């Protein structure tokens, strides 16, 4: 029962995370790239500083990682293996975290109400800032979920220990990469 609630949350929160990044890319990013709206000289052609590699993180989750987590739905005790298989893809969270400070100042110093206007226009409860923290939040949440499964899975749970190792190793490497 507990291993089933945790797996269900893992999957449901993975879907919301893909939906959230998608929302971010097709509103806040799409306005900057469109050429449908007037763009503060301050941020112009600096979408790569603002959004960092979030495109590639979305692609990972949306192309691969949600499809693979789904396959482990009836195999919660094994799901640590999903993280092992895809450990390299998670290295993009290191790039993303390094860049986030630069992203945030740029938006303060140079974007005025550009994104606030798009937020109002599109009807979004989440600010561009609320969206841009999510990759940081998500990469530090996987280790919580894996620990929860470790509290309620048998000695058949080195198909968790090595998952958790990976998902402790990524956020520390991302942490240790900050200036």
């Amino acid at each position: 029962r507990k291993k089933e609630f945790i797996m269900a949350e893992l999957l449901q929160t993975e879907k919301a995370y893909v939906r959230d990044l998608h929302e971010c890319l097709e509103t806040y990013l799409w306005e900057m790239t469109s050429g449908v709206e007037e763009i503060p000289p301050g941020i112009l052609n600096k979408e790569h500083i603002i959004f960092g590699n979030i495109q590639e993180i979305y692609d990972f989750h949306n192309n691969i990682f949600l499809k693979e987590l789904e396959k482990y739905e009836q195999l919660p005790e094994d799901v640590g293996h999903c993280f092992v298989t895809w450990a390299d893809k998670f290295q993009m969270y290191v790039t993303y975290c390094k860049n986030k400070p630069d992203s945030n100042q740029l938006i303060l110093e140079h974007a005025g109400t550009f994104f606030d206007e798009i937020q109002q226009r599109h009807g979004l409860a989440n600010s561009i800032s609320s969206y841009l923290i999510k990759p940081v939040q998500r990469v530090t949440k996987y280790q919580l979920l894996l620990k929860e499964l470790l509290t309620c899975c048998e000695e058949g749970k080195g198909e968790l220990k090595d998952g958790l190792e990976v998902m402790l190793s990524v956020p520390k490497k991302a942490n240790d990469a900050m200036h």
């Binding site: 986030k100 989440n126 923290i133 939040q137 949440k141 919580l144």
Partner: protein, 177 residues
């Protein structure tokens, strides 16, 4: 209408995720305590002045000293939390939380929140603490901590019973207006 960013900081032992879920759903989640609370906004009226309240969790980032501050900029108010039945969590207000919150957001209102009020009068909890030569954190300890960190308020609450919980968030808003 006024937007308010509220970040919730403190040890794993506070039950940050559970606090925010029990606040936003008007219920202790009981069966299963979810590990994920996603960034949240909701219109509330405070002193008859409607406000858009934003709540961000930080659960999972307790070991990443350089990742946590990524949420800090442009925060209107911090809840700095400890569990009333974790002396360690209480000391970490002084040792860990207040320093990094001051370092990055010097002029931002802090509410000091003691969580798990329902466990301060619980025999098993009390006894478990006595075995480590400890007691729960009492009211004057929180007041004295609040003063020391420049907290605008010290408040005690239970996610379980909902006691003091709504007041915590009312006061977070009041500390900004």
């Amino acid at each position: 209408m006024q937007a308010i960013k509220c970040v919730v900081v403190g040890d794993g032992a506070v039950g940050k995720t559970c606090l925010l879920i029990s606040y936003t759903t008007n219920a202790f989640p009981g069966e299963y305590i979810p590990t994920v609370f996603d960034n949240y906004s909701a219109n509330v009226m405070v002193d008859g002045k409607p406000v858009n309240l934003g709540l961000w969790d930080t659960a999972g980032q307790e070991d990443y000293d350089r990742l946590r501050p990524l949420s800090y900029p442009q925060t209107d108010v911090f809840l700095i939390c400890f569990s009333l039945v974790s002396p360690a969590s209480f000391e970490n207000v002084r040792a860990k939380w207040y320093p990094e919150v001051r370092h990055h957001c010097p002029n931002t209102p802090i509410i000091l929140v003691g969580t798990k009020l329902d466990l301060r009068d619980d025999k098993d909890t009390i006894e478990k603490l006595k075995e480590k030569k400890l007691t729960p954190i009492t009211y004057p300890q929180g007041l004295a901590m609040a003063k020391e960190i420049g907290a605008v308020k010290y408040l005690e609450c239970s996610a379980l019973t909902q006691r003091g919980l709504k007041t915590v968030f009312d006061e977070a808003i009041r500390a900004v207006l």
